[PDB]
Amino acid sequence: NYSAMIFETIVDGKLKTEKIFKEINEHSTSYTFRSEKGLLSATQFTQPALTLMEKAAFEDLKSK
């Protein structure tokens, strides 16, 4: 599920279907997320949390 992630950046010539997490292969055992302060402010964590909080808030109001 980490492998199959893709993106497309312009690299000097043309488009490129390069994958995220170049380290992760079929022989990888660990991957590590590194921050300076905390993972909460690294935007692949910020974004879902923010989204959840708001949806959660809404469903409470919908229940009421």
Binding site: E54, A57, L61, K64
Partner: protein, 46 residues
């Protein structure tokens, strides 16, 4: 945080002075985090 509340609040301050009064239109600006009691309708006894 009330980011968009502020953005809405100050947009009405700028160019909706003449328009809101013209319709007798009362406006209510609410954030979830701050203005919980008005949205949940659960004020204190007071």
């Amino acid at each position: 945080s009330p980011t968009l509340a502020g953005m809405a609040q100050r947009t009405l301050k700028n160019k909706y002075e003449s328009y809101d009064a013209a319709l007798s239109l009362h406006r209510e600006i609410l954030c979830y985090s701050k203005d919980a009691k008005e949205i949940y309708y659960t004020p204190d006894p007071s």
